[PDB]
Amino acid sequence: MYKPVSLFLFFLILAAAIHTNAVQSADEAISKAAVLIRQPWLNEVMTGITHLGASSFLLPLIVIIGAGMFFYRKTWDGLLMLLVFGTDRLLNKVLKEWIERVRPDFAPLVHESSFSFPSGHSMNAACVYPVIAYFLVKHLPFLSKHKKMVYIIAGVIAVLVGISRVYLGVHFVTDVLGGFSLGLLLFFLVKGFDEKIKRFR
């Protein structure tokens, strides 16, 4: 499928491009430009939003949803969601420790110690929220007339989490795009897998 291949190729192009001075310069300018629109009230809003992409929030979220699905439909798809989440975290950690990009460190509003590329919160969100959308639409019949709106919400949440990492001064735009592309890649792989094994269309 062209979608997952294209996201993979895009990530590779980014992983090369962040080593050019021209991209590094644009990344710094956008990071610093984001500081210009900060207000203390918005700092708080953006910090709350960023928690929607944190592993400590998404793991219990996945378990609660998976449990709800089991009680409602007797499905075990919750384990599939946990599996993709675990793969997402392992992949992000390996890539971070291999690329070793230094954090922006101009004006961070939340503290993070690790390397910055790819962004963990962006990768978490771009994978988990679309995956939740897929399994909720799969299993909750009363959502089948709101399919598009469910996916729109997932996409809005993911985009806002990414924005918040740049706003909050702990990731560059390119860290966020790299994370987005790989999280979406993993969503499409799980979705393609689950649709494949269906015995009825």
Swiss-Prot record:
Active site: H121 (proton donors), H171 (nucleophile)
One annotated GO molecular function: phosphatidylglycerophosphatase activity
Region annotation Phosphatase sequence motif III: where it falls in the sequence: 164-175
Record-annotated disulphide pairs: none
Native source species: Bacillus subtilis (strain 168)
Keywords, in A-Z order: Cell membrane, Hydrolase, Membrane, Transmembrane, Transmembrane helix
Regions of this protein lying in the Cytoplasmic compartment: 1, 75-78, 140-146, 197-201
InterPro entries: P_Acid_Pase_2/haloperoxi_sf (IPR036938), P_Acid_Pase_2/haloperoxidase (IPR000326)
Cited Pfam families: PAP2
Name by which UniProt lists this protein: Phosphatidylglycerophosphatase B
Enzyme class: hydrolase
Reactions catalysed according to its record: a 1,2-diacyl-sn-glycero-3-phospho-(1'-sn-glycero-3'-phosphate) + H2O = a 1,2-diacyl-sn-glycero-3-phospho-(1'-sn-glycerol) + phosphate
Annotated membrane topology: Multi-pass membrane protein
Cellular component GO terms, alphabetical: plasma membrane
Cited function: Catalyzes the dephosphorylation of phosphatidylglycerophosphate (PGP) to phosphatidylglycerol. Also has undecaprenyl pyrophosphate phosphatase activity, required for the biosynthesis of the lipid carrier undecaprenyl phosphate.
Region listing for Phosphatase sequence motif II, in residue ranges: 118-121
Extracellular topology ranges: 18-55, 100-119, 168-172
Family, similarity comment: Belongs to the PA-phosphatase related phosphoesterase family.
TM segment ranges: 2-17, 56-74, 79-99, 120-139, 147-167, 173-196
Region listing for Phosphatase sequence motif I, in residue ranges: 96-104
EC number: 3.1.3.27
Gene3D superfamilies: Phosphatidic acid phosphatase type 2/haloperoxidase
Highest taxon, organism lineage: Bacteria
Residue numbers marked as site, Stabilizes the active site histidine for nucleophilic attack: D175
